[PDB]
Nucleic acid binder design. Structure first.
Length: 89
DNA sequence: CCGTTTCGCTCAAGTTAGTATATTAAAGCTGAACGAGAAACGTAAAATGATATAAATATCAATATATTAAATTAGATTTTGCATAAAAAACAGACTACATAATACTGTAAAACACAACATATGCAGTCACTATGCCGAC
């Protein structure tokens, strides 16, 4: 992979970059080069967004096996089970 | 004696009957840590119980007679409780004199930055290689 995922990519489209000088670039699916898009975040992002298309349903993440995860997991039944206990008190 | 069916029971999902509180305000309860003076104890030293026997000293009744400590007065006086009042010193109530800050006003250097023509390294702009398995193709 070489770079894998990084931290700045966490909030940037697939074909988008982010140099050291807070600048963003536009990758090219022909040779691998890139150009200069914008200085802002949502601006450079939206640009790469309208380039190919938006994200998807959720998140990709597909290395080789798996790793730690700490996302959202709200549920009604789960709450209800905790509610029945509070009632007994 | 034993099996079979009805009946007493409790679990599970609808159908009704009843009563109504939150903050202020000020305590009251109780586990746990905090800080000295007096007497029961105990080993050690001083006074006393132990112990006995012929000789020395005290035990005491019954009454005369000189002696004396000391409570009982009785009058004398330091001692003790309580102010009164003025000489003497403290200290606000005045006031000008004196040295000192806040302020009144003039005199002068210079901080702080816009404005404007250049000068140019450096970040950004644009393209190819570095570095190593995908994908696609065979096994």
């Amino acid at each position: 992979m070489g770079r894998r995922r990084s931290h700045e990519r966490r909030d940037l489209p697939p074909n988008l970059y982010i140099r050291n000088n807070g600048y963003y670039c536009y990758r090219d699916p022909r040779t691998g080069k890139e150009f200069g898009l914008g200085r802002d975040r949502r601006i450079a992002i939206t640009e790469a967004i309208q380039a190919n298309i938006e994200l998807f349903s959720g998140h990709k993440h597909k290395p080789l096996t798996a790793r730690i995860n700490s996302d959202n997991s709200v549920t009604l039944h789960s709450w209800l089970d905790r509610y029945e206990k509070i009632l007994a008190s």
